[PDB]
């Protein structure tokens, strides 16, 4: 019906910088738009209503503007408290959200691979874990290869929240197979592609 496009999906800035989040409506259905803030582990919080009216108790560094189809939330001089998720809203429609991330210099991941444990094998399951440690930006590509054959749809990724000290991310990728399938193949490898790596990094082992 009506779609609200928030731009960008992620905004990477340093404390003390100006953030400008964008919300575009497919068909202009109101000059009035509301902005909400959601910090980790908290309920959403209204910042702006009717495009430019600041809610009660909201710091003045938050200001909204725009009319028709284009709306903007400005956060003057970002503070550590502000790196959160922000949503725009018109009537029953919500934007997909924009995550405000702490920016830092690119950091390549340290990659480690962990074979299944003997104890787990005894139980008839094999979990191969690939660890990507302390990297930035969050965009990372992990590719499992069993006997040099690409896998698909049989792995799961989990990513930590940006670290409070060095602002890096870590990522795990778990390949889960049955004991039978795990012992039919010899070579297990996880290939990592990241903008901080000049070429992909592969960590592998023989069962």
């Amino acid at each position: 019906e009506i779609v609200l496009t928030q731009s960008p999906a992620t905004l990477s800035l340093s404390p003390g910088e100006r953030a400008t989040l964008s919300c575009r409506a497919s068909q202009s259905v109101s000059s009035y738009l509301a902005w909400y803030q959601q910090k980790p582990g908290q309920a959403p919080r209204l910042l702006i209503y009717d495009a430019s009216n600041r809610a009660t108790g909201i710091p003045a560094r938050f200001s909204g503007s725009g009319s028709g189809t284009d709306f903007t939330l400005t956060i003057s001089s970002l503070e550590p408290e502000d790196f959160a998720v922000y949503y725009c809203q018109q009537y029953e429609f919500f934007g997909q959200g924009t995550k405000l991330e702490i920016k830092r210099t690119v950091a390549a991941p340290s990659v480690f691979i962990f074979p299944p444990s003997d104890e787990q094998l005894k139980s008839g399951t094999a979990s191969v874990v690939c660890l990507l440690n302390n990297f930035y930006p969050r965009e990372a590509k992990v590719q499992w290869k069993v006997d040099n054959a690409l896998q698909s749809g049989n792995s799961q990724e989990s990513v930590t929240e940006q670290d409070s000290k060095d602002s890096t991310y870590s990522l795990s990728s778990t390949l889960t197979l049955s004991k039978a399938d795990y012992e039919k193949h010899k070579v297990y490898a996880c290939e990592v592609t990241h903008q901080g790596l000049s070429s992909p990094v592969t960590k592998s082992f023989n069962r």
Binding site: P44, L46, Y87, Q96, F114, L131, S172
Partner: protein
């Protein structure tokens, strides 16, 4: 001051119904529309409907029409949202929110109610080592448990630097899984003990697993 206090956590099987309450205080209950908004784990906000506590008129999102019922008990200043035929996609945090005056926006929010949808039963995890080999990485795999959460410490909390406990991932079996890892100097692997202390309160599981190279 305005206050919206919702009911506590819910755990339901798929196909059941759930009724979340939202008790309002500090203002004229009938004077302001109440909306319901939900947030599934790790994604955005989704509007469900509103009720007008003055008279009881409702307006539901099309995707919940016939499934959801919003009511209010003016005599105890409480609004309710009942969702039936629960699906796995209904697992989310549900919020009640009040309009400030008459504009369609959410000025006052309840604290939120987690509604878990699962066919699984309480179960403690199996803890498997992630054996390592200037820095080396090791960890522990905490596999197949329900419900969340588990807590992982290293050397009884004496080791906190470099620790990374990943968010749990819901497997297709309905059970959760996560790994906790830590980076340590390579020069100490042959003599330093590394024990992950896993705690799953629901199952009374307290497993200490030594992680040797």
């Amino acid at each position: 001051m305005v206050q919206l206090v919702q009911s506590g956590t819910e755990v339901k099987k798929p196909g059941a119904s759930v009724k979340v309450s939202c008790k309002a205080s500090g203002y004229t209950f009938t004077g302001y529309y109440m909306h319901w908004v939900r947030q599934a784990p790790g994604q955005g906000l989704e509007w469900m409907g509103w009720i007008n506590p003055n008279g009881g008129d409702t307006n539901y999102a099309q995707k919940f029409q016939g499934r959801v019922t919003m009511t209010r008990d003016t005599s105890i200043s409480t609004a309710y949202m009942e969702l039936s035929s629960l699906r796995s996609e209904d697992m989310a945090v549900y919020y009640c929110a009040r309009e400030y005056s008459s504009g369609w926006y959410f000025a006052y929010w309840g604290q939120g109610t987690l509604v878990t949808v699962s066919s699984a039963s309480t179960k403690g995890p199996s803890v498997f080592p992630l054996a390592p080999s200037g820095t080396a990485a090791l960890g522990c795999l905490v596999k197949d448990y329900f419900p969340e959460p588990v807590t992982v410490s290293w050397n009884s909390g004496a080791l906190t630097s470099g620790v990374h406990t990943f968010p749990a991932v819901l497997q297709s079996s309905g059970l959760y899984s996560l790994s906790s890892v830590v980076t340590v100097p390579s020069s100490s692997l042959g003599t330093q003990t590394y024990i992950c202390n896993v705690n799953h309160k629901p199952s009374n599981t307290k497993v200490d697993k030594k992680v040797e190279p």
